[PDB]
Amino acid sequence: MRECISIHVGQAGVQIGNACWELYCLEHGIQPDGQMPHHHDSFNTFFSETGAGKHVPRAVFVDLEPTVIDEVRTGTYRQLFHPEQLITGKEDAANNYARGHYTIGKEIIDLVLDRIRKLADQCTGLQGFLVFHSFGGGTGSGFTSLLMERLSVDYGKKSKLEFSIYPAPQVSTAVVEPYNSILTTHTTLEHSDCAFMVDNEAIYDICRRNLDIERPTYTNLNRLISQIVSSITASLRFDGALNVDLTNFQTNLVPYPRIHFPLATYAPVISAEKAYHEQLSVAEITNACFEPANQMVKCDPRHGKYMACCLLYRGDVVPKDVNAAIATIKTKRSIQFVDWCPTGFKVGINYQPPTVVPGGDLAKVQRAVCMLSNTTAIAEAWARLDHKFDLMYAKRAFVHWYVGEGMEEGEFSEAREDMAALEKDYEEVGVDSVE
Amino acid sequence: MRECISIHVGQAGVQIGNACWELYCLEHGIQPDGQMPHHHDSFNTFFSETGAGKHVPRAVFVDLEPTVIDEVRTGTYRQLFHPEQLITGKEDAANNYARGHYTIGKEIIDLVLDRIRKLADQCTGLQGFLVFHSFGGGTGSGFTSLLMERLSVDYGKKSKLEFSIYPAPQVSTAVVEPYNSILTTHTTLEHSDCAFMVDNEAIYDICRRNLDIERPTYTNLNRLISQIVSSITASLRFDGALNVDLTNFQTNLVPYPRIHFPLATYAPVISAEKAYHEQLSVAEITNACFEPANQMVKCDPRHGKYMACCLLYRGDVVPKDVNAAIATIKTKRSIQFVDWCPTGFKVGINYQPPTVVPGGDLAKVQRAVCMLSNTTAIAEAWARLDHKFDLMYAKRAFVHWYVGEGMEEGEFSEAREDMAALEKDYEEVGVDSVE
Amino acid sequence: MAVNVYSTSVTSENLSRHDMLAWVNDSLHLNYTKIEQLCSGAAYCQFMDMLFPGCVHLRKVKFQAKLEHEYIHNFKVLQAAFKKMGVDKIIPVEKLVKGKFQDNFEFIQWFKKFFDANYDGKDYNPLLARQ
Amino acid sequence: MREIVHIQAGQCGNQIGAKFWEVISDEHGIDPSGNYVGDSDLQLERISVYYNEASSHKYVPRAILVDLEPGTMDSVRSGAFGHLFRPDNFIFGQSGAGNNWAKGHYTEGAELVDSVLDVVRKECENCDCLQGFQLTHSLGGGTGSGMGTLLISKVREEYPDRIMNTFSVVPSPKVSDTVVEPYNATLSIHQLVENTDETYCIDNEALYDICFRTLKLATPTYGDLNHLVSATMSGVTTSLRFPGQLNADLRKLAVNMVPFPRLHFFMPGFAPLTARGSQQYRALTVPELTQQMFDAKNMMAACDPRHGRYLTVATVFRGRMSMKEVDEQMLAIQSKNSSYFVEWIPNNVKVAVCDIPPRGLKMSSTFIGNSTAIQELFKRISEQFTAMFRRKAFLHWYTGEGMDEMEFTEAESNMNDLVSEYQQYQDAT
Amino acid sequence: MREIVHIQAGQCGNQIGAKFWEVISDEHGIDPSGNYVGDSDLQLERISVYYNEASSHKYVPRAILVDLEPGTMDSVRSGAFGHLFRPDNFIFGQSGAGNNWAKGHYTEGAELVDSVLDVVRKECENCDCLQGFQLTHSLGGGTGSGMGTLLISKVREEYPDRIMNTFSVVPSPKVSDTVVEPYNATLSIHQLVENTDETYCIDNEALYDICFRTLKLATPTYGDLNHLVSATMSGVTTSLRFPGQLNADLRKLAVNMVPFPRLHFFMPGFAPLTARGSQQYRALTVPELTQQMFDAKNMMAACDPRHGRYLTVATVFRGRMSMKEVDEQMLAIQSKNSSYFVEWIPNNVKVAVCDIPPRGLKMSSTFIGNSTAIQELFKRISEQFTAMFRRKAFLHWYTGEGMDEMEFTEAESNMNDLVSEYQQYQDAT
Ligand SMILES: Nc1nc2c(ncn2[C@@H]2O[C@H](COP(=O)(O)OP(=O)(O)OP(=O)(O)O)[C@@H](O)[C@H]2O)c(=O)[nH]1
Ligand SMILES: Nc1nc2c(ncn2[C@@H]2O[C@H](COP(=O)(O)OP(=O)(O)OP(=O)(O)O)[C@@H](O)[C@H]2O)c(=O)[nH]1
Ligand SMILES: Nc1nc2c(ncn2[C@@H]2O[C@H](COP(=O)(O)OP(=O)(O)OP(=O)(O)O)[C@@H](O)[C@H]2O)c(=O)[nH]1
Ligand SMILES: Nc1nc2c(ncn2[C@@H]2O[C@H](COP(=O)(O)OP(=O)(O)OP(=O)(O)O)[C@@H](O)[C@H]2O)c(=O)[nH]1
Ligand SMILES: [Mg+2]
Ligand SMILES: [Mg+2]
Ligand SMILES: [Mg+2]
Ligand SMILES: [Mg+2]
């Protein structure tokens, strides 16, 4: 009855969404062709049923380069998606923010908005949009910045959750990542309700250490991402003792208009071999999700303070045991809250145990936790990126590509001083003040 | 409801622990794969019980050289242990206390402590630690010292029992044994509640004479030590007419802060052929356990005076018979006590007869005695070890290795003076004094 | 930074409850009658101020705590300077706040050793510091 | 006669109410399908107070269940025991209030209050003689607190000469279910103390404590907590549903326990509470029932009575008992525990006795005491609100939907004033 | 009427109490399930003194079993005749006292006595007219000694005008069960002398001698020892439990046997004790009963009365007999055996007669002597403590948990003063 649509831009969004939509069809028992064969509409919020038994997803796959999307048209999920929704261009943005925001993106933005408007009108109880985009890309960073300016105008006040891919501190696929990341953050800082952050390097440590896989390809990495996403909207599709909505994370995790950068975390992540030798009780999976070696962004929360938290259990979870486990977590002192936040926990319990994808690495479990911490420790992640941008912009390296594609050298300075204000605001609010 | 955990350090510790855990799994009726077909809970005190019927031990096998741990992994007890609990390094300490305590052992101590903390937080009624380690071994000595320091820092006041392997006067396998023993004794003289001592040569003599085996490999010694440990823990594990605890042993056997080096003895040790021709009465098993040739440390208590004694009977034992036998033993000539200890016996009785490992050397018995004596005869062993250390250190042998691996001669000098002070205190306390 | 100490088994240094209470009462000038009354954490916070000037904001600590929930907040300020000072002793504040003889003597026994190691003989009154 | 209209708002109200109409149906012998299947004729003597006669001896409850988010209705409409509610009363919105005051009181609650006042008004006209309203909600949520308060203000204007009770679930000190708890609680208390006759404050942390030690349970779900609150909610009403030696009702309790118009915050209780295995080792008698009431362990709100003085106390016994033993022990309790009762209110104990014991029990009773220890609950909330409001944390989503800083100032001063009047009557002589 | 509250401490207290309740249930005809199965109504005439009535005519013992280590509680619950105790009374900790008086009096004692005092207060207020308390324990263990001392002190503080008996298992002189006996023995005896009323000292070696020689048993066990002790205790209580020609009570016994406030250490004994084979060759009569009673070999405390003088003697008979025979034999015994009777206490014999013989016996008798032979036991314990404290052994583990040498010195001084006064009153003319 209540609807939410998802938009995937760039290669990272399409590849992640390809693994995410495989999970939804498994949870609701949807065959790849669209037909159908705690437990008990459910699929209505994500799948729009047609006249026949076919259910088509509410997804809009958009990219400029047609290489990745053509795999979806050919792959096993060929008859599921709506043929028109897969929007493709001719040439990529080529890791250039200007190309995907001023020159090439402008020729396709009108086609995308037409399909978005057609999906919204077909539905009645639209909640908000979920956007899966990267940060170092050209059409995943310069185009999703154009979508925010357009979506926020057609629809005034709606939830807009983003699932970004933070550039790693040491691991780096591109060389112009500091240029695209700084420009994107300055523009989508006023058109994003909350932006969950994920780093690619941090997932490698989780898969190698906890799950014990020595060959974590991008398909094994994208399986961990989809589990968090399904946990965010688990209460919309299932009935639980204490439900939450997309607006609940919105109010509970954003104390200030600019401070809306939480970092996700999942638990438990264990292999099948170690599943038989572990009790996996509520009292310790809460502890597992709080250790600094399990966070999914390469930043240690010990150096900062927790502005707010949000836990989302699911399965055979007793509401009494959650209170006891959380009460002693405030006792343990890997946790340090802020002075002006006497209450700093939000709990949501669901009655649907997490499902497993056959052929995957995760084992079947009866309990799960998806913590969404909003900590001050992410300020060190902005400082590191702001240092790379300042070093490379000093000698105007790589600038001639941006200037000649429809941007001005003055615009580069405006985004630089904006991140200086964000860094100052983040530290000043977090640090204590007299009276 | 009462939980005690065991830490095995070094090759000797790992092998002794393997024998001990085989004995425990036999005693509690646990199959090698972890399933199971006075007794009920019992296994709760040692075996943590998971979601299925599988019970996993509360053991932390730690080593630097991976050979023995890989042997344990490949062995028949493969499905029992938790795979994460088995911790290995890359290269051994190589009979170097400096290598095992300062350079190498500092790179795995954090993981060991994290696993120990997780195991302790899993349980609710934690009682103490049982540490199985040797003295001659470099990794055993160094890592036992490090673990003692770290556990004493983390947990304030808990029972920390150790089952050492005292170097034999003649039988030996190393050349830096005096150095290692002196250093480890000086370091962990203040971080041990009670340190039971066991020697290889005495067990060799016992197995040669009493049990009549002419090929006594290390398995028989491991079985004997495991039997002693199980007899010690039987009071916690089972019900009985007169129960004793780890704190009971600790209180009744340590009269002075430094004099906490008791020696163990077991009875009766007879083969299968000699079992049919013996009555096995309480008085005669008490006499056998009190005989000098049955002691498991190469020192005859006739040269010293008993300071404290602890008898532990298991089986069809009558307290009247125990009282009569103990009164007769106290009357006997060879048993001499200290003047300031008018009462010198602590008696415990248990209703569970000892079990027999199939294929083992020992035969089935209905009565068993474990005798722990804190006496003065260990002063001669301390003096012999001190003389060996002084003779070797008079001309600075192997000190180049020890100094090159992050140590200074000041540590050697302080260890020497501390051992001299300990010997002086032991002699002064043991000797009589007027008024 | 501060030098750490341990306490597992030491003789000739274990003080009685009467002497330990006298040392606490005389040092900070209160009228404590039971060692189980130290679970509030108010007296403990002032000890850190004496040992190291500053490093503890004596305003956010409340001394009139009488329920179970401000005791937890009190300890969140007492040894939050432990991380600042580098001392790595972790106490069971979840179990300390119950006001039992079980741990309230064990922690004060350790604190006496810790206080004696880092005390250089400085003297200051607590009357104006408290008010 | 003297019918009671039941209103359930939020998620807790819909979950407590769903477990409340199970107790009432069992008491009156009403089948889940909605038709009488009982045996004793005393049950049907006064059935119109809660239920409502329809065609073919079908009884439908006189309750309306309304919540902004539609996820809760499908849990009770499609679940068991959902075949007896009238489908018209199932009122729901489109999206949840998002744990917000303004989204539950100005923006999204204003579009639904006009569709719920036309069902209360219609239910009131079919009534013979209205007695009062009942509201079950939470003080920490968005729609349970935001729009449940809006219903109180609208109803009070239409029916000023009526008595309504709120079975609120006040937040807990140890854990917080919502990070922005104080903003919703403070803004609601300032509205409750205006136009409610009496309020029963209930806690979740105290329900875990009671169920863990007294009831000796290991895994108390929310089904067991609501089953414990529902017993107290039925104890108050049962005096006007069944004949008794000394009858009472909603109006009688309000007169005896509200000395001043701003002091109507009560702390409920219940007895006996025993485990399944340890029930044959106790003698069920009035002696030990009154002993179980007055111990601080068996209190439904996390407030120790030893920190304050009982202003007034009312106990509603049930079952069949001698009338002498009841008065003999309230004198002994008052005489022995003479230091915890106020001095300027003599004989501050109200007694009522019914004659129908609950299902599967020889005798029981309910305790409702207006104490002064409640002041420690309002002192804690006003402390948390001050810390957050000074830094303006989370406030820029309460201003963006109608409200302003000026509204927050009144809610804090009013709550601080009520605390001062609550303590002034404790030390007064 | 005249209810008695029973408290059991430590492993010894728990086992002795289990045997005692076995004997009491057999005497009163109470089925192990807890319901009356007996025939005569004289058992039901006075059953509230020990048992407690409960719904469905059940009977629950008025016992409070408590010990730090849970092993004894698990054994008593899992074993037979554990289905009648009230589970609330089952109180235990997690870690034992470890034979440490400091640990049993200052570390676990706090919470344990808080819970125990709560239960004791509830039981006492449930009782109609309290008569006294009973505590069975050992002076050698840690938990029993220290925590029974703490319980006695708190009960004395709460109920000053009440009686309590302590059945203490004193350490043996020949063989010691624990190495550090004297410290606990001295501290416990000091506290008991301070704040108890009467104490029946019982040894183990004397019981073993009695069982081996008189009973002619090859393998005497703790079951038989506890059987003998429980028989003595039941014989003590039967005087007020049952009607008789010349009744006696606990207060009567205390008044008659305690001449001075510091002299309440009695020696018990039982008659007749005969082997199974040699029971049909004896004529059961008061002459031989008294003859078996009044010989040192039939003494349950390892002290030879020939080394001292009987300050006072009490004799509780059972069964049916003749007062003429009883008093005539008492006079004959006093006249023939005058040498070891105190001269300045004329008429130093108290006699009481009941009317119900024990199960499977025509008649029996319990003898309680306040003599001066306990001086040797106190002297031996004081000498051992003096040696151990002079050499300062095991003491840093009493100093490390609160105590100090001042307490030990005070306890030793009190013990020496008590023994000196005992001797000086033995040798008075
Ligand atoms: N976690 C995750 N990240 C991915 C995956 N595939 C690509 N990425 C991220 O995407 C980045 C590559 O840039 P993209 O955002 O994909 O750029 P694009 O979509 O190819 O568009 P152009 O920049 O115009 O070429 C890499 O740095 C990766 O971090 C994936 O499968 N999983
Ligand atoms: N009783 C007994 N002693 C053993 C056994 N295995 C080894 N030892 C003792 O252990 C000593 C060898 O030193 P270890 O502690 O094992 O040293 P390690 O584990 O090989 O590691 P490194 O010290 O680095 O060489 C020998 O002197 C033996 O006395 C065993 O199975 N039984
Ligand atoms: N006693 C009891 N309390 C509950 C139960 N379920 C939820 N609660 C309490 O009710 C609160 C839920 O907030 P609500 O007022 O119901 O909010 P909502 O109905 O979900 O609507 P929103 O505020 O917009 O999210 C939680 O803080 C819980 O403490 C329950 O089953 N029993
Ligand atoms: N007569 C008799 N005495 C017993 C029996 N069992 C134990 N005892 C005595 O009671 C003492 C036992 O010490 P306890 O006070 O029970 O100590 P605990 O319960 O084991 O716990 P700790 O005090 O910590 O050691 C022993 O010294 C025995 O002499 C019994 O069955 N009959
Ligand atoms: Mg691309
Ligand atoms: Mg090795
Ligand atoms: Mg809601
Ligand atoms: Mg014990």
Residue numbers in the entry:
A (entry chain C), B (entry chain A): 1 to 37, 40 to 42, 47 to 441
C (entry chain T): 1 to 131
D (entry chain D), E (entry chain B): 1 to 429
What does the paper say about this structure?
Microtubules are tubular filaments composed of αβ-tubulin heterodimers, which adopt a pseudo-helical geometry. Microtubules switch stochastically between periods of growth and shrinkage, a property called dynamic instability, which is critical for their function. Microtubules are stabilized at their growing ends by the so-called “GTP cap”, a region enriched in GTP-tubulin as a result of delayed nucleotide hydrolysis after GTP-tubulin addition to microtubule ends. The structure of the microtubule lattice in the GTP-cap region differs from the one of the GDP-microtubule, allowing members of the end binding (EB) protein family to selectively recognize the GTP cap, binding there with about ten times higher affinity than to the GDP-tubulin-containing microtubule shaft.
Moreover, we could demonstrate that polymerizing ‘mosaic microtubules’ consisting of a mixture of two mutants, αE254Q, and αE254N-tubulin at an optimized ratio, can eliminate mutation-specific biochemical effects, thus generating a faithful mimic of the GTP cap. First, using TIRF microscopy, we performed titration experiments of 20%Q + N-microtubules to measure how much mGFP-EB3 bound to 20%Q + N-microtubules. mGFP-EB3 revealed high affinity with a dissociation constant of 14.0 ± 2.6 nM, similar to that observed for pure αE254Q-microtubules. This affinity is also close to the affinity of EB3 binding to the wild-type GTP cap (39.6 ± 5.8 nM), in agreement with these mosaic microtubules being a faithful GTP-cap mimic. To this end, we imaged undecorated microtubules and microtubules decorated with an N-terminal fragment of EB3 consisting of its GTP-cap recognizing calponin homology (CH) domain. EB proteins were observed to induce compaction and a negative supertwist in all previous EB-decorated microtubule structures solved to date. We report here two EB3-CH-decorated structures with a negative twist, but an expanded lattice conformation. This expansion means that the presence of a glutamine at residue position α254 at the catalytic site can inhibit compaction, possibly arresting the microtubule lattice on its pathway toward the GDP-microtubule lattice state. Remarkably, the EB3-CH-decorated αE254Q and 20%Q + N-microtubule reconstructions preserve an expanded lattice (82.87 ± 0.00 and 82.89 ± 0.00, respectively) while displaying an induced negative twist (−0.23 ± 0.00° and −0.28 ± 0.03°, respectively). Considering that any previous structure of a microtubule decorated with EB3-CH showed both a compact and left-handed twisted lattice, we can conclude that the presence of αE254Q can block the lattice compaction of a GTP-microtubule lattice, even when only a fraction of tubulins carry this mutation as in mosaic 20%Q + N-microtubules. In WT microtubules, a negative protofilament twist may be transiently required to facilitate compaction of the GTP lattice to allow for efficient GTP hydrolysis.
